[PDB]
Symmetry: C2
Subunit: 157 residues, 2 copies
């Protein structure tokens, strides 16, 4: 029960939009990875899709508590990618943009004394930094090994 | 193991796009309905979101069997709606457009002898016609009763 800040609700709606795109893209990627027998990549991206659902659930709760409603910006084109490196690099691009939006919203919420929205978003950001770190590390390995040597190292004994 | 028809894969990718939008929109709607204490509407839309996930899983399997990859058209703006009638009417709009695309793809797949893709899509269409019928029936009741009388009839004894 409270009427929240207009711009904070706007940020929460932009962020919930990001979650929906990420849930969609990790879903598709996970399934492609499983098809190619890349078990680890499927397991982690499927796991992080669950994190993203949780984030979207938190955003929706908060928007509704602030007496707003879910209302979304255009969610755009998903750049799925055609090979494993392109897939991961496109996930990293979403995550980096999403983290930038989240830091902007944290700063703003903090500035106008919406500390509960701020703190929710801080917890979500810690999760997103984990999502970024995984992707960066895997893409670093693809650079060091070469893509095909990297894919071969995914094959289980 | 087979290289499928280019246009059939294109249809499967357009249809998988529709599933992703529908999964997103039913997700958000379900949560809004639950917040307003509309248990039946939440339960059914949450249930149909599961059907849509299954449809997207079938599309992805088939695209990958046909040696294609998931590759998506712009998924656009979700028109969430601001009241229950607008929400349902926007779901109906997605469903009607999605069914039109599916009948087009069925006709095409049939015409070029891709009977396995055709038959998969026929099963999905039967599900979509059930999704349409629910929405139509509820919107008919909102017209007959008036929205507020309809919402009041959702309140459980």
């Amino acid at each position: 029960a409270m009427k929240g800040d207009t711009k904070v609700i706007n940020y929460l709606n932009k962020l919930l939009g990001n979650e929906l795109v990420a849930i969609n893209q990790y879903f598709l990627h996970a399934r492609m990875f499983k098809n190619w027998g890349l078990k680890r990549l499927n397991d982690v991206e499927f796991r992080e899709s669950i994190d993203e659902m949780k984030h979207a659930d938190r955003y929706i709760e908060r928007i509704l508590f602030l007496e707003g409603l879910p209302n979304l910006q255009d969610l755009g084109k998903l750049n799925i990618g055609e090979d494993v490196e392109e897939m991961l690099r496109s996930d990293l691009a979403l995550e980096l943009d999403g983290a930038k939006n989240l830091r902007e919203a944290i700063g703003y919420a903090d500035s106008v004394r919406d500390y509960v929205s701020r703190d929710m978003m801080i917890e979500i950001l810690r999760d997103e930094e984990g999502h970024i770190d995984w992707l960066e590390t895997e893409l670093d390995l693809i650079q060091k090994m070469g893509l095909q040597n990297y894919l071969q190292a995914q094959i289980r004994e």
